[PDB]
Structure 1
Amino acid sequence: SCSLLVASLAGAFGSSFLYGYNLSVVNAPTPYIKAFYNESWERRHGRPIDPDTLTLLWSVTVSIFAIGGLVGTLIVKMIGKVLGRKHTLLANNGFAISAALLMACSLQAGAFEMLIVGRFIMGIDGGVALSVLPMYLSEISPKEIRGSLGQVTAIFICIGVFTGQLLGLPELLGKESTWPYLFGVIVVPAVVQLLSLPFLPDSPRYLLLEKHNEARAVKAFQTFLGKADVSQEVEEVLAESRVQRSIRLVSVLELLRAPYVRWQVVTVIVTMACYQLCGLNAIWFYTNSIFGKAGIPPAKIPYVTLSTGGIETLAAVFSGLVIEHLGRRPLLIGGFGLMGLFFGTLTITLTLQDHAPWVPYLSIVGILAIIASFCSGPGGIPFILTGEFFQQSQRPAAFIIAGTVNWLSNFAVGLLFPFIQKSLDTYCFLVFATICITGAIYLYFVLPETKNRTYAEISQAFSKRNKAYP
């Protein structure tokens, strides 16, 4: 049904909206929570806090979000066998609310505990929310446009990040006080997802293979498709089902010891190890700090910051015309190299900062090129690259190895960024430059074209490089 198209859009809204929000909520109250941290550690552990460990306390406070995602990757392979798909999607609503109330209690109490452990309960909502959804929301009415749903998931991450700056302004909600409500505003998107979940009927391919409930399924497909002809669409979903139970689900550890995936387990991880160490997550995270040191005038940082996430939204909608026309190889490999030079130009601005008054205005232009290069370049392409990278026997095991490196890497970039700032001062992005160009070199010589080609030449092209032939 056409009316369900926006309902399904809302069904994918709160899960994607919330994950992006947590990446940008750090941005506005960054000095305010640190001052509130100062009121902590003197109340019970009475002594002034050394600045060396003060940054450590904030660094673990921000990076713990990634760790909750990592256990969110591991929780699926236990809970998924007995809990249902909507039932698992029902659970994160409870985790989101429980996480929010701990955040709302942050100023009610006088401790730092609830912020750290409470954000762990936000981290698990960065898990199953972005581990259930992306390959399991794929129940839009047309089955041929599913490539759009790849980017539809990605665009709402932009708004989730974008609303963080909007709701963190010095006029709307981000003040010296009322900062718990900046965290406490996360309730209303959660309940909206909770409100739409009963409104969303069910998962049409779940009840067919698990519950054996074809009588209710045919009514479900009429709700999604909105058409009377249903027999052809219910027979095709069983067509692949017999193939699924014919094939053997290969375990996780058998990949890391198989010689035919010697340079394929290590190349899927570095395709997305260069997704979090690409640095953009650091941009979103610590944006208030980094713009301040680049010669920017004070009292306007949030006033210019909206462009950091603004073009993220604009580039995402503009990415629809790029994927089909260019493919998946040249923009992925060309995206990293395009911004490898821009880090150098960024570092030129950050080093000088004084020769002209437009140098700080040149610094911000460098940042906007990085986001424009990213969403248009490597965006959701690594998510869908890995889908066709392996075959269907190891694909459910693909995200087991891919998810774990995703969040440990996100934990790595979040934890070590502030230490690099205080140590390397203005050359802090040189390390970020080395890793990103490394992805350009590594992926150039290994990855062939993947657009519009079936697995046969994907394997045959790789078999040459691998001398695989087991």
Structure 2
Amino acid sequence: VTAFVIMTCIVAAMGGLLFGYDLGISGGVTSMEEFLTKFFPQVESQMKKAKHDTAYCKFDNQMLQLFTSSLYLAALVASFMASVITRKHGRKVSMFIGGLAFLIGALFNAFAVNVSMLIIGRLLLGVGVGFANQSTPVYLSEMAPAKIRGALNIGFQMAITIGILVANLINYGTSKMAQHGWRVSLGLAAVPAVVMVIGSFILPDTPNSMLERGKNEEAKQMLKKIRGADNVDHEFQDLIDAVEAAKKVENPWKNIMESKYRPALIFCSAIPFFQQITGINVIMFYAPVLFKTLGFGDDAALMSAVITGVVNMLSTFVSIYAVDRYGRRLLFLEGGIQMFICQLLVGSFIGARFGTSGTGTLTPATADWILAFICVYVAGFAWSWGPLGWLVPSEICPLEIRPAGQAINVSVNMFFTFLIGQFFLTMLCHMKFGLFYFFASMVAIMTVFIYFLLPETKGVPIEEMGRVWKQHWFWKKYIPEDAIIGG
């Protein structure tokens, strides 16, 4: 562990600011009537004097769903392109492309004069997220010393939560400008993108990719630099062994179906689906919608998003502290149990407060308790399925399929992020609290899935992770001894 590798990983992790900024900025921008008037006049007409309505609830027709979907579709496709570039040219090159596409997208948005420019900008944001999310977790998990890989990789998730929070605060400010507030909100996304582009110039690439691409002496000297030791022979032998196997595989997409990759393939596919079917991106807007329906105004709705965003960010530190000391499993298990219980409590609390009230409207105190329970659910996600959904796929793949497995992770993640968010929009917007019971049942399923099927990965050198699958009661049948590195 050196100061150079920690600074390297902090700078690289700032690639998560891009996706997080976009996740946090969009809600507040859609509620700005100047934005609606310019680009979505059919929505503006529905929102005029609709004191108890929320503008993104109106994005439920085919054309508006197409606009919303375009970011996730571009990200899903760009993720697959990033797998090829990340392997052939390096993790840094994909991080550069991600920052640059996001930067150009932010400018098209901020200076949009018609919806055509908004569509181009949104597609470019999606390209940026696809490249940034595909490549940055690979970068962190290869660069980090094995002992603290969890903590350093989760810097990426921390950056996501920082972007969400910062973006909500920016919308708080730009909502007060006399004019053009939405241009400032969408244009400030360029700031972390410029940081990411310049970072991609100055960062080194990973020794793992340098060696796979034939830069033998550069890779060894780089490993010595990030580990701060003249003798890296044991860990460099891991890289040599990983590249010897990896050089045999010209097309990872045509080999990822082989038995020896099956545990990795299952988890790279299942973890992103499970991460979204927690309901996180639905539940995170339940209280904002509730406060608006109760008459508390746009500012109270945004304030609950800021509160939720602070909890979301600060709770990430629990995973940073515990992930390498106590393990990924403990975090999955506690986080799933805590999320499950909070979903049961909020669902039954809302259901009960209508059968005991008498007046038909929830009180402010009741709304605050609903936000409180939701915040404990968000805290549980924020130290489990949030950070681990960007850590675990990046640390379980052999080198030759590591960019491809992380591309599966991103692309499945984008697909279900949109699908689940759109599918539940009407239930969210009509305050159908039964959704908490559905997501509770999914969280039960994924927690049992983890309990029986996820071997503990903490502290294992990334190229030696086959050792962990080989000792798992179920996955051991897929892993041949000859493929295992180290031991």
User: TM-score w.r.t. structure 1 length?
Assistant: 0.80
Partner of 2:412: 405
Distance 1:91 1:171, change over 3 A: closer
1:61 paired residue number: 67
1:204–1:220 contact (8 Å) kept in structure 2: yes
Equivalent residue for 2:161?
Answer: 158
1:147 Cα deviation after fit: 3.0
Give how far 1:206 is off.
4.2
* Among 416, 424, 446, the residue aligned to 1:417: 424
Given that 1:270 and 1:439 are in contact with CA atoms closer than 8 Å, whether structure 2 keeps it comes out as: no
Which consecutive residues of structure 2, in runs of 5 or more, have no partner in the other structure? 48-54, 355-360, 481-487
Contact 1:349–1:360 (Cα < 8 Å) also in 2: no
Cross-structure match for 1:274: 274
Match of 1:90 in 2: 96
What secondary structure sits across from 2:122 in the alignment?
helix
Distance 1:175 1:149, change over 3 A: farther
Q: Report the alpha carbon displacement of residue 23 of structure 1 after superposing the two structures with TM.
A: 0.6
Q: How far apart are the structure 2 equivalents of 1:105 and 1:455?
A: 49
Is the 1:349–1:362 Cα contact (8 Å) retained in structure 2?
no
AA matched with 1:241: I
Q: Equivalent residues in 2 for 1:300-379 (5 A)?
A: 300-324=300-324, 326-351=326-351, 352=353, 354=361, 356-379=363-386
Q: Per the alignment, do residues 409 and 456 of structure 1 end up closer, same or farther by CA in structure 2, a change over 3 Å counting?
A: same
* 2:74 partner letter: G
Determine whether 1:169 maps to 2:176. no
Please report how far the alpha carbon of residue 404 of structure 1 lies from its aligned counterpart in structure 2 after TM superposition.
2.9
Matched, 1:237 2:236: yes
CA contact 2:154–2:387 (8 Å) conserved in 1: yes
Supply the distance in 2 between the matched residues of 1:422 and 1:305 (Cα, whole angstroms). Answer: 16
Structure 1 residue 423 displacement after superposition = 5.9
Aligned to 1:458: 469
Instruction: Say if 1:182 and 1:81 are closer, same or farther in 2 by CA, change over 3 A.
Output: same
Distance 1:4 1:443 in 2: 34
Cα distance between partner residues in 2 of 1:243 and 1:458? 16
- Deviates further, 378-387 or 283-292: 283-292
Aligned counterpart, 2:192: 189
| Secondary structure, counterpart of 1:273 in structure 2 | helix
Partner of 1:55: helix, strand, or coil? coil
Cα distance in 1 between the residues matched to 2:226 and 2:412: 35
- Could you tell me whether the CA contact under 8 Å between 2:140 and 2:149 is conserved in 1? no
**What is the deviation of 1:257?**
7.5
Judge conservation of contact 2:15–2:196 (CA < 8 Å) in 1: yes
Mapped partners of 1:457, 1:95: distance in 2: 37
Shift in Å, 1:369: 0.7
Contact kept, 8 Å, 1:134 with 1:153, in 2: the verdict is: yes
Identical-pair percentage: 22
**Which one-letter code corresponds to 2:303 in the other structure?**
Y
Shift of residue 446 of structure 1?
4.0
Secondary structure of residue in 1 paired with 2:27: coil
How many equivalent residue pairs? 458
The structure carrying a bigger helix percent of its residues is: 2
Give, as a single letter, the amino acid of the residue that structure 2 aligns with 1:55.
Answer: D
State the alpha-carbon separation in 1 of the partners of residues 233 and 377 from structure 2: 45
CA shift for structure 1 position 96: 2.2
Query: What letter matches 1:91 in structure 2?
Result: I
Kindly state the Cα deviation for residue 172 of structure 1 after the two structures are TM-superposed: 7.1
Distance between the aligned counterparts of 1:373 and 1:463, measured in 2?
28
Q: Secondary structure at the match of 2:278?
A: coil
Matched, 1:101 2:103: no
Give the secondary-structure state (helix, strand or coil) at the position aligned to 2:15.
Answer: helix
Residues 213/403 of structure 1: CA separation in 2 closer, same or farther (3 Å cut): same
Judged with a 3 Å threshold, the aligned counterparts in structure 2 of structure 1 residues 425 and 468 are, in CA distance, closer, same or farther, namely same
Contact 1:296–1:360 under 8 Å retained in 2: no
The alpha-carbon distance between structure 1 residues 175 and 119, as it changes in their structure 2 partners (threshold 3 A), is: farther
Structure 1 gaps, min length 5 = none
Q: For residues 52-110 of structure 1, what are the alpha-carbon distances to aligned partners after superposition, in whole Å with 9 as ceiling and x for unaligned?
A: 9753354443333222221122102333455344333332333122101210222xx1x
Once residues 389 and 95 of structure 2 are traced to their aligned partners in structure 1, the CA distance between those partners, rounded to angstroms, is 24
Q: 1:122 aligns with which of 122, 125, 138?
A: 125
**Cα separation, partners in 2 of 1:455 and 1:184, compared to 1, 3 Å:** same
The CA deviation string for residues 259-300 of structure 1, in whole angstroms up to 9 with x for no partner, is 994x87555533331101212233457874354236756642
Aligned-residue offset at 1:306: 1.5
Evaluate the alpha carbon distance shift between residue 468 and residue 325 of structure 1 in structure 2; reply closer, same or farther with a 3 A threshold: closer
Other-structure match for 2:442 = 435
Residue identity matched to 2:71: F
Q: Quick check: 244-253 or 143-152, which moved more?
A: 244-253
CA contact (8 A) 2:336 2:444 kept: yes
State whether residues 260 and 466 of structure 1, in contact with CA within 8 Å, keep that contact through their aligned partners in structure 2: no
| Alpha-carbon distance in structure 1 between the residues aligned to 2:256 and 2:223 | 37
Secondary structure in 2 matching 1:25: helix
Cα distance, 1:153–1:93 mapped onto 2, change above 3 Å: closer
Q: Does the CA contact (< 8 Å) of 1:173 and 1:179 recur in 2?
A: no
Distance verdict in 2 for CA 1:79–1:341, change over 3 Å: same
- C-alpha change, 1:366 and 1:175, in structure 2 (3 Å) is farther
Cα deviation digits, residues 192-246 of structure 1 (max 9, x gap): 33334444355555445435373x6677567656x5x53x237843552244224
- How far apart in 2 are the matches of 1:295 and 1:345? 24
CA distance in 2, matches of 1:300, 1:92: 34
Structure 1 residues 204 and 409: alpha-carbon distance in aligned structure 2, compared to 1, 3 A threshold: same
Letter in 2 for 1:194: V
